[model samples]
Target: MEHVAFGSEDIENTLAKMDDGQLDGLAFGAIQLDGDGNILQYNAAEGDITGRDPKQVIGKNFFKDVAPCTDSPEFYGKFKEGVASGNLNTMFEYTFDYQMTPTKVKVHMKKALSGDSYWVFVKRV
Candidate 1:
């Protein structure tokens, strides 16, 4: 399969067309959350990467419960800043060290144009 560049317009367009089940087929993790960080959609790849079921993460605060490691000033802080500013389109490399599992990943956070939610895309780096 051709590699889809993360944070690319192509990927963003593809994501816009996909439903919850279709998101699981993606090579990366696709998470849709509310402005408050509550997970609205969690894909299968995310479950495999974090070792948590989708059911467990849905309706939960991502920064607070699903990925507490991201609750720090660097991660959640930026998210809050983006939501407040209404233009969140940031990408960076990060490491997940919670629960004794250290995993390197690329994170992309984007604010939806609809102004109802945001998306967090993750791919192992």
Candidate 2:
């Protein structure tokens, strides 16, 4: 199977076809969230990057419990907008500033092709 890029135009589509093994091999973090922002597919890369166990946050709320730093309009608001619109595909620079060291990264939020969820692609800057 082909490897996917963080900024690939059809990332959601590509991710839909990847298995867990291939998904875990990605350099960046890939997080899948339900319409209500609950964490679903928290991969190894995300756990490594955030210094948190994916298993612990698998069913938690991404914006509220796991990553409250993004609960503001600039971050979480964008997510709500996408879910409401039904076509989430936005990318911008963001900083991870919750419990860990402040890290700058590019965030790509997209509607997942696999089902009724969203894919948040984060790559360190």
Candidate 3:
């Protein structure tokens, strides 16, 4: 496997140095989304989970990038509701494209104070 500049290895190292920095332990993808569901930061863990590289994931709108699965009306609606109710610590299981071995995903999201950003963690089970 090739290496990305700020990929898993870097993320692991960086997180190790921080007091409260961490990422998912499973083969999953993560998107740092804005209030408007825009992709601010996408990581290699997500790339490995979705079989896509960071190049194809980054700079693309989160909702637009993975629509019909992640960026759907239902998904966004739930996200909005979570933020509104301040019930951020919620986890739900959902499926994405099944063609790729029935992509079962567990998603957890909430408002983060990292500069108008939110943390979206996904784990492919």
Best by TM-score: 2
Off by over 4 Å in 3: 1-28, 83-87
lDDT comparing candidate 2 with the true structure: 0.87
Model 2 C-alpha lDDT per residue in residues 48-111, reported as the tens digit of each score: 8888887788899998888999999999999999999888888999999898999898999999
Clash-forming residue pairs, model 2? none
Model 1 regions more than 4 Å off: 1-4
Residue-level error in angstroms, candidate 2, position 99: 1.0
By TM-score, the candidates rank as 2, 1, 3
Candidate 3 per-residue C-alpha lDDT over 4-86 given as tens digits, one digit per residue, 9 for 90 to 100: 22223234333333221234333455567776777766667777667665656556666665544665555777887766665
Backbone clashes for every candidate come to 0, 0, 1
What are the models' TM-scores?
A: 0.89, 0.93, 0.65
Scored against the true structure, residue 108 in model 2 reaches a CA lDDT of: 90
| Better by TM-score, candidate 3 or 1 | 1
Top lDDT: which candidate number?
2
